[PDB]
PDB file of C-alpha atoms and ligand atoms in Angstrom:
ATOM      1  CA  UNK H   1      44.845 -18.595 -59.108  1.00  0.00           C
ATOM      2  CA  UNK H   2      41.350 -17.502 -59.085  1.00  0.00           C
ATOM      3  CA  UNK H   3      37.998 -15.811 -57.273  1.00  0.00           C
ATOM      4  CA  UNK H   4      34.667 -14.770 -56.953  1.00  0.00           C
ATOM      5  CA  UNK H   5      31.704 -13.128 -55.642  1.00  0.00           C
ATOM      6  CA  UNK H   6      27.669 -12.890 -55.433  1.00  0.00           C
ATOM      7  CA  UNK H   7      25.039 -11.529 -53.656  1.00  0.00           C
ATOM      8  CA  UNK H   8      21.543 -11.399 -52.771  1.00  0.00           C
ATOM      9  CA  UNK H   9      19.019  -9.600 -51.420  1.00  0.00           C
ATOM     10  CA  UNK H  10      15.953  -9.767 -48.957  1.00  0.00           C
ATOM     11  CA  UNK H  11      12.721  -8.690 -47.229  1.00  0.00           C
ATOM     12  CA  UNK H  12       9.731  -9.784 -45.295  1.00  0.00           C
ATOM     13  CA  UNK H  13       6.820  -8.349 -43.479  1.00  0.00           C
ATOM     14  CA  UNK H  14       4.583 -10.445 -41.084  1.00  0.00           C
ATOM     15  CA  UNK H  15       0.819  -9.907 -40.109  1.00  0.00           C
ATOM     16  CA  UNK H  16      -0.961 -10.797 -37.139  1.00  0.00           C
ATOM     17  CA  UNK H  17      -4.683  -9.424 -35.463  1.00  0.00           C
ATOM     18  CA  UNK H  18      -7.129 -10.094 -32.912  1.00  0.00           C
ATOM     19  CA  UNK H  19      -8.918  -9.465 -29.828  1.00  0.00           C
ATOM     20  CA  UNK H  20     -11.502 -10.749 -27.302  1.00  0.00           C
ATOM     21  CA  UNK H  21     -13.660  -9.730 -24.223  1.00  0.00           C
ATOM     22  CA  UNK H  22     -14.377 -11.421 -21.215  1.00  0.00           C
ATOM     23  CA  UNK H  23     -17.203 -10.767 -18.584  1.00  0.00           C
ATOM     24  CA  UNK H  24     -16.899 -10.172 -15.033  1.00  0.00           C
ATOM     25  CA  UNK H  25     -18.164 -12.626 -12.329  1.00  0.00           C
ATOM     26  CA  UNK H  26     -17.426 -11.875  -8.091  1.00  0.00           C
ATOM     27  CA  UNK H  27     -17.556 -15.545  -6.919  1.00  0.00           C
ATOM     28  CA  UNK H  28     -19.432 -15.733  -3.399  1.00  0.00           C
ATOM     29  CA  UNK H  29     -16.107 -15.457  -1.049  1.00  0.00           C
ATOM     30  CA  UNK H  30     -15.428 -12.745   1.990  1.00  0.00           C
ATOM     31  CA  UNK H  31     -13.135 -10.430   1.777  1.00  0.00           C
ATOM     32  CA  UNK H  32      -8.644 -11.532   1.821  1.00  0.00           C
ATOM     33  CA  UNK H  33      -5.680 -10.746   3.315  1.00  0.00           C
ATOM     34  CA  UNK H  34      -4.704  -8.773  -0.096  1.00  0.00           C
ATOM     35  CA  UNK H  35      -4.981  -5.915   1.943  1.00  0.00           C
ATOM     36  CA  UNK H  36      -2.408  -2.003   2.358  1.00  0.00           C
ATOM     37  CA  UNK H  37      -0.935  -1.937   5.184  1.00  0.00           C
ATOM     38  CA  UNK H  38      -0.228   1.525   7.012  1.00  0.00           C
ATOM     39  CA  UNK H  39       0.990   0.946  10.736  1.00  0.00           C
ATOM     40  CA  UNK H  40       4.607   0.884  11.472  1.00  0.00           C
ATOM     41  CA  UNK H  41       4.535  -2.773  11.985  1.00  0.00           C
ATOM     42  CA  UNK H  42       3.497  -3.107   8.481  1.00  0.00           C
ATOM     43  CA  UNK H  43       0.089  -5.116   8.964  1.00  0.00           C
ATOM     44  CA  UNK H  44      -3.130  -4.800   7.738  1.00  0.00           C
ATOM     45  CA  UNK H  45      -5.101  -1.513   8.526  1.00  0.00           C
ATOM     46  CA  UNK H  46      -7.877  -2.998  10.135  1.00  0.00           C
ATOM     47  CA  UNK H  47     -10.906  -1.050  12.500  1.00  0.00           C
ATOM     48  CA  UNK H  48      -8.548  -0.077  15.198  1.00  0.00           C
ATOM     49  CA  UNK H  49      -6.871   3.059  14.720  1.00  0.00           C
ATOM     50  CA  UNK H  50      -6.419   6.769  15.840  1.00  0.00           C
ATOM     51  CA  UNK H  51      -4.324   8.264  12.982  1.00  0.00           C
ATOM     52  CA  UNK H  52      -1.932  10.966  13.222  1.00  0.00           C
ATOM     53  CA  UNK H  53      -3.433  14.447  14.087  1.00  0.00           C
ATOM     54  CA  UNK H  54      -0.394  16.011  11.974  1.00  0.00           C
ATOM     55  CA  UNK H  55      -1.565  16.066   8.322  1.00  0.00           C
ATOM     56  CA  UNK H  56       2.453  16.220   7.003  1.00  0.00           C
ATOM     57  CA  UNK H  57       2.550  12.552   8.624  1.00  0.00           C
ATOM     58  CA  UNK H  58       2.831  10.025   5.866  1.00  0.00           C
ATOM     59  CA  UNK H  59       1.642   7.147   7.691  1.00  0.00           C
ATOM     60  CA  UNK H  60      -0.932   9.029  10.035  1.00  0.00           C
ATOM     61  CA  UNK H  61      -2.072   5.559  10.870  1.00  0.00           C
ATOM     62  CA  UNK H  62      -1.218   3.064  13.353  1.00  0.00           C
ATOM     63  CA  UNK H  63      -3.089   0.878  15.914  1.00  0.00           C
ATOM     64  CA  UNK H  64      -3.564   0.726  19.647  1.00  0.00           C
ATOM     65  CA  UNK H  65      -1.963  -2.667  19.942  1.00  0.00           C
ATOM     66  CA  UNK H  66       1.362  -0.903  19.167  1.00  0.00           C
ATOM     67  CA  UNK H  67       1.376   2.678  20.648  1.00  0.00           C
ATOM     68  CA  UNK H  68      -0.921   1.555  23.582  1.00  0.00           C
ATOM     69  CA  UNK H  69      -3.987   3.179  22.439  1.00  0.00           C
ATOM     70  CA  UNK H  70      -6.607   1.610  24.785  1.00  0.00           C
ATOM     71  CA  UNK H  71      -9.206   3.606  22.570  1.00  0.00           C
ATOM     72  CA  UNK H  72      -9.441   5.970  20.012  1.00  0.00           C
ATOM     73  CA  UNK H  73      -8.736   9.481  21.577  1.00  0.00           C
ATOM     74  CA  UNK H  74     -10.284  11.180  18.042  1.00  0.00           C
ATOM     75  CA  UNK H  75      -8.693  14.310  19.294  1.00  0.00           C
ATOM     76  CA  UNK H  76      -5.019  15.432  19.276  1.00  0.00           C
ATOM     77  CA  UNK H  77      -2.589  11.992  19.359  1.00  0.00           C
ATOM     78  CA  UNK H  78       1.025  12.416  17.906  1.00  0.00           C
ATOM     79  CA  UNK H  79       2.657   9.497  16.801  1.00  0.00           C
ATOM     80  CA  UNK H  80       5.458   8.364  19.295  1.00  0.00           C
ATOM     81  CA  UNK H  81       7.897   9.146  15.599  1.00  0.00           C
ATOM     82  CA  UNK H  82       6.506  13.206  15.654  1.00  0.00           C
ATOM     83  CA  UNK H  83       6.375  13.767  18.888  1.00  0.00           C
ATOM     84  CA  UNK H  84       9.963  13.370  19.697  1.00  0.00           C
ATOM     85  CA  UNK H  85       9.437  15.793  22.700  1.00  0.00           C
ATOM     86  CA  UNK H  86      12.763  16.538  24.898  1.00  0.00           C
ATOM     87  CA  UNK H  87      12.070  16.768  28.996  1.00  0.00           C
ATOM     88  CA  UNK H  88      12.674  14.905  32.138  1.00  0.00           C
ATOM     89  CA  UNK H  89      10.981  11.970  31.718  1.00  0.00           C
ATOM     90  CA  UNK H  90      11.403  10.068  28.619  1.00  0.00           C
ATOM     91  CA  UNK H  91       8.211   8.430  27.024  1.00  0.00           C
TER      92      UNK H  91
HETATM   93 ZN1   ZN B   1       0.485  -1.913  14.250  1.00  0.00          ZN
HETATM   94 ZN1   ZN B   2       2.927  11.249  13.012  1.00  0.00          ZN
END
């Protein structure tokens, strides 16, 4: 019979740099639909809105289109989710 054997060994070590700026330019366009939204229907946070008088209220935003807000009160209006009141007459 017979056999063998060998070896070798090995290494390496790459290199790579560089870097560039670019300016800024705001194209003439109005504003976009990119926009949060806050309200409980989950739409854009537009003009229309009263916001939660309790400050522990995440949302604290909404609009009048949704919790029949003909105008902004801008005084003490729960949302219909703190509120929760218990009497009589639900609502
Ligand atoms: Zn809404
Ligand atoms: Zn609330």
């Amino acid at each position: 019979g017979s056999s063998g054997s060998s070896g070798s060994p090995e290494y390496g070590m790459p290199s790579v740099t560089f870097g560039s700026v670019h300016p800024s330019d705001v194209l003439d366009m109005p504003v976009d639909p990119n926009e949060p939204t806050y309200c409980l229907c989950h739409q854009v946070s537009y003009g229309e809105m009263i916001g939660c008088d309790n400050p522990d209220c995440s949302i604290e935003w909404f609009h009048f289109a949704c919790v029949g807000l003909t105008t902004k009160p801008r005084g003490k209006w729960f949302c219909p989710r703190c509120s929760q009141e218990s009497g009589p007459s639900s609502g």
